[PDB]
Design an enzyme around this catalytic site. Structure first.
Site, mmCIF file in Angstrom:
data_model
loop_
_atom_site.group_PDB
_atom_site.id
_atom_site.type_symbol
_atom_site.label_atom_id
_atom_site.label_comp_id
_atom_site.label_asym_id
_atom_site.label_seq_id
_atom_site.Cartn_x
_atom_site.Cartn_y
_atom_site.Cartn_z
ATOM 1 N N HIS A 34 35.289 36.814 33.208
ATOM 2 C CA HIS A 34 35.758 38.356 32.966
ATOM 3 C C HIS A 34 35.404 38.911 32.134
ATOM 4 C CE1 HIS A 34 38.930 41.218 33.844
ATOM 5 N NE2 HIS A 34 39.225 41.059 32.658
ATOM 6 N N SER B 198 39.182 45.887 33.211
ATOM 7 C CA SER B 198 40.008 45.055 33.296
ATOM 8 C C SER B 198 40.768 45.852 32.700
ATOM 9 C CB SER B 198 40.045 44.179 32.034
ATOM 10 O OG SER B 198 40.780 43.437 32.092
ATOM 11 N N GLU C 261 36.832 35.722 38.441
ATOM 12 C CA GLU C 261 37.688 36.175 37.380
ATOM 13 C C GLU C 261 39.308 35.567 36.616
ATOM 14 O OE1 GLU C 261 37.457 39.371 36.808
ATOM 15 O OE2 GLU C 261 36.070 40.694 38.178
#
Ligand SMILES: *[C@@H]1O[C@H](CO)[C@@H](O)[C@H](O)[C@H]1NC(C)=O
Ligand SMILES: *[C@@H]1O[C@H](CO)[C@@H](O)[C@H](O)[C@H]1NC(C)=O
Ligand SMILES: *[C@@H]1O[C@H](CO)[C@@H](O)[C@H](O)[C@H]1NC(C)=O
Ligand SMILES: *[C@@H]1O[C@H](CO)[C@@H](O)[C@H](O)[C@H]1NC(C)=O
Ligand SMILES: *[C@](C)(O)CCC[N+](C)(C)C
Ligand SMILES: *[C@](C)(O)CCC[N+](C)(C)C
Ligand SMILES: C[C@H](O)CCC[N+](C)(C)C
Ligand SMILES: C[C@H](O)CCC[N+](C)(C)C
Ligand SMILES: [Cl-]
Ligand SMILES: [Cl-]
Ligand SMILES: [Cl-]
Ligand SMILES: [Cl-]
Lengths: 528, 532
Positions: A437, A197, A324
């Site tokens: 995610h 991320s 995501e």
């Protein structure tokens, strides 16, 4: 001693730790910078001054000051990402895991946590480096960096709050590895930085920054790239948010020095309490204090640097997860709940796209809506949910990364792309969220290798080949040891699925939607 | 005497024609207006003045002056649409087919040929009305109207070339049927107007025009509607083209009187030779002289009239063919060929879209391209060919018609929508063209009923049920025979939006005909091109 090591800044005493019916060395909380407290808040990091005597490196350090998610109290799914130790501005430390016996000039892997630049800790359980260091016999290092206003308040021009200090903290940790890893058995000329991320975007940003390039060999980006719409802001937007933070706290806004002196007198939690009030729009997947395109850490715009090939040229391995966007819809979009299928009405869908693309006009919103709505059945709540799920994911993660992969590959020395789409069998989140995610992380760090965590044998095997792909890549630039993970080329653009089933090769990952997000929408918003 | 009928304009003598082992009466070439020749060219039509004696109506009349297609000399596929009689400006006549013995007060159907408003004839073999009139026992009328510049040159303000005179020619023929059809055994209170392509747009235009409304009962529109992007132009665009035509012939462009005087001196073929030079851009499915939104025949913008329900409220039956655009791609888009599979490269695909949506800005072009391109396989010659076919058909026919059907239905009194997707077993055109624009007409007029034409047994049955749907609709406003066994053609409703496929297989009911693409063409693209 195997646990006593002399670094260039002083001595450190590690601790022998148990790992999968065996052991390895662990050096926890080694300071790599001077505590950025007092008048050092918002300022660039200064190298840690040498110390006398032996530094106790047997326990984890404090976590940086940050916003803490209290949405689901006691719920492991959200808490596993919250700081698991005291928070403090004195948080610039790093951790090292060395295999026992100490190897000689071996491969090094540096972990950079994500968290939207507003949160994160190097001490989290899912970041426990013992499993990966032991299994793949590499020296694993996890660094830390200031998040939120503390690490990204940007007042370009000033030198008391120049912006990007968080990235500079990461740089200082890497510089520390460059100078001391050899003393632990690491090969400084073979360093692989990797992060998820915001940590993936950071990795990408170091690949771009001139002052960071010589500090690592290869890079791994997981669900994040430097060009994500949330990963950066202009100097102008950084200043506006900086001043708005002052305003929110009744600060003197006559000048930068006055504004900064005021902000340096406030307690950490006072800043954090109003952090979100500086965003320009109501939205999701958007964060207040992030890196800024200052012309210094970043020579020119990210795009121009990518087109001219102005960046480190080496081997990269990057990929994304199937869903995501679900995590962020759950926290900021209407109709979503942790305890239900979350069928989204048509009205909530509209509200959702507006939240997902806060900067787009009405025509742009119509474009996004038409692009993700099946008009033979628009009132289908499941399709509206998944559509919103894809919108958030394609626009904020997947497509920005694909734009990065295509651009990089023109000058790079080898690209490997992956699509992680496996649903953990012990996932505590609802099923509608799918492959979330950040949940590939537990596989990258070998968590499925410990029985007490109750994973399936197929998942353990998955984790073992993922760790081996990562480690083998880190030491050679190829995840394949002499089914093969094909190289991503400009022509064929191949990538592989990453799950419990046998390898499968595909081409042009979500090209249809990404042509929309990387070429059509941008062009439409520029024209209108 | 069945063949001797006296109308308000004078006596007429028809002829007995053979039809499927039987016979019917036919009155061919009856005049309904004064020859729009000489100083009458470009002018509104005038009623045919009474004549003495018996008018011989046993042969077809002349066809109006028009562009003739010579792309494929000798090819039946294209020549079946060209004039099969001598062309002349003196062409305002109509044909009538009457069942024998003569009915007392039966249903009447009036046919309005298409041809982009630049061509067409009432005398083609595919329009032979003896089969339909005989099988469904209705009074079938075939009318004609000036096409091209002769019928649509428009210089708003002038009364010598006001525009829409071709639409007025149609009105006058309907007025004639209204006043004399009773003399042929049909009920003027029950006339259904139907047409294909430009004919279909016309029918939709009469439904909208306050001056045509009381001249018919119901309406059938085939592959054409009033709001099509090619069926009309603004008064300004009409003037530019009118002036441009003069410039192309070295005409005095100092005033409408001089320009019009100059154009009236020219020979028919002289105007026709430069007809296509007046178009705004290189394009396909675009025609030079078409109806104009004059504020007269058309009170206000077509769109505002549909939103306010300003139009005849009755029952309508309309539809489209599966491959509306292939015919126009073959004639004007690179890569297309009659004697090939026509696999289109990416380069020609780009060119094609530019050509199909000539009024689009670069942004609008990218939007269309993205909407019809499979990026996982962009160099696929076949997907590129079919994509183009879909683009041309969706933008020009299908989506404009869906817009019409959804707007009309909010005020109408009954809507039936069809999707014709049958490829005739004896088609002369290449396989890639599919279900071609205009090829449902042969089924409508019963051509499949004549053995020597070699249609299959299933095509004959299809033709029979289509003619029955059409006629029954004309008679009652419902294509279905009450309490009959056969599967029912459901009404199209604003809510369920149902429609049926029309082919040799059993009936299938569908919903929301091409909604995805039509949302793009009717809602998104327009908003995009508007912004700046
Ligand atoms: C280092 O700190 C840990 C925890 O505070 C403690 O258990 C350990 O004894 C310390 N190291 C020594 C032996 O000085
Ligand atoms: C990487 O660089 C080496 C040496 O310049 C070259 O031989 C090799 O082909 C490159 N690898 C790729 C896949 O670009
Ligand atoms: C009408 O014209 C047809 C065809 O030329 C001819 O056979 C017929 O005798 C004509 N009728 C009369 C009486 O002129
Ligand atoms: C048509 O109008 C009649 C007369 O009012 C009405 O009874 C009928 O419901 C209408 N039919 C439709 C399909 O709207
Ligand atoms: C990325 C936006 O840095 C977000 C990462 C979120 N967690 C929950 C995985 C830390
Ligand atoms: C319509 C545009 O009016 C086209 C009519 C063409 N034919 C070939 C069907 C006559
Ligand atoms: C995913 C997440 O915790 C977002 C933070 C929530 N607000 C904006 C309410 C502070
Ligand atoms: C549709 C059609 O046959 C067009 C006629 C060809 N041009 C325009 C070139 C004269
Ligand atoms: Cl353990
Ligand atoms: Cl704690
Ligand atoms: Cl390449
Ligand atoms: Cl529509």
């Amino acid at each position: 001693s195997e646990l006593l090591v002399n670094t260039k800044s002083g001595k450190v005493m590690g601790t022998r730790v148990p790992v999968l019916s065996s052991h390895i060395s662990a050096f926890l909380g080694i300071p790599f910078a001077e505590p950025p407290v007092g008048n050092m808040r918002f300022r660039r990091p200064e190298p840690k001054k040498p110390w006398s005597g032996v530094w106790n490196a047997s326990t984890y350090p404090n976590n940086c000051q940050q916003y803490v998610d209290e949405q689901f109290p006691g719920f492991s799914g959200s808490e596993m990402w919250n700081p698991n130790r005291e928070m403090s501005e004195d948080c610039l430390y790093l951790n090292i895991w060395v295999p026992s016996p100490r190897p000689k000039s071996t491969t090094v892997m540096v972990w950079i946590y994500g968290g939207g630049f507003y949160s994160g800790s190097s001490t989290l359980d899912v970041y426990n480096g013992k499993y990966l260091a032991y299994t793949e016999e590499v020296v694993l290092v996890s660094l830390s960096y200031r998040v939120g206003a503390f690490g990204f308040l940007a007042l370009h021009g000033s030198q008391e709050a120049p912006g990007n200090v968080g990235l500079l903290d990461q740089r200082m940790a890497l510089q520390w590895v460059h100078d001391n890893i050899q003393f632990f058995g690491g090969d400084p000329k073979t360093v692989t930085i990797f992060g998820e991320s915001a940590g993936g975007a950071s990795v990408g940003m170091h690949i771009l920054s001139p002052g960071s390039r010589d500090l690592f060999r290869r890079a791994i980006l997981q669900s994040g790239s430097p060009n994500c719409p949330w990963a950066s802001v202009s100097v102008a937007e950084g200043r506006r948010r900086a001043v708005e933070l002052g305003r929110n706290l009744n600060c003197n806004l006559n000048s930068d020095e006055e504004l900064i002196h005021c902000l340096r007198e406030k307690k950490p939690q006072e800043l954090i309490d109003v952090e979100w009030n500086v965003l320009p729009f109501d939205s999701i997947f958007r964060f207040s204090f992030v890196p800024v395109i200052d012309g210094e850490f970043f020579p020119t715009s990210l795009e121009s640097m990518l087109n001219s090939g102005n960046f480190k040229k080496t081997q990269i391995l990057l990929g994304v997860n199937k869903d995501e966007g679900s995590f962020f819809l759950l926290y900021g979009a209407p109709g979503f709940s942790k305890d239900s299928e979350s069928k989204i009405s048509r009205e909530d869908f509209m509200s959702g796209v507006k939240l997902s693309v806060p900067h787009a006009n009405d025509l742009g919103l119509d474009a996004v809506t038409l692009q993700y709505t099946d008009w033979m059945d628009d009132n289908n709540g499941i399709k509206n949910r998944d559509g919103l799920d894809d919108i958030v994911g394609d626009h904020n993660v997947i497509c920005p990364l694909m734009h990065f992969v295509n651009k990089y590959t023109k000058f790079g020395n080898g690209t490997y792309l992956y699509f992680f789409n496996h649903r953990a069998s012990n996932l505590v989140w609802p099923e509608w969220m799918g492959v979330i995610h950040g949940y590939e992380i537990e596989f990258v760090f070998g968590l499925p290798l410990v029985k007490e965590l109750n994973y399936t044998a197929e998942e353990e095997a998955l984790s073992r080949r993922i760790m081996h792909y990562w480690a083998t890549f880190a030491k050679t630039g190829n995840p394949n040891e002499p089914s093969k993970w094909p190289l991503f080329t400009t022509k064929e653009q191949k990538f592989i699925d990453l799950n419990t089933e046998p390898m499968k090769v595909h081409q042009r990952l979500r090209v249809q939607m990404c042509v929309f997000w990387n070429q059509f929408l941008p062009k439409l918003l520029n024209a209108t």
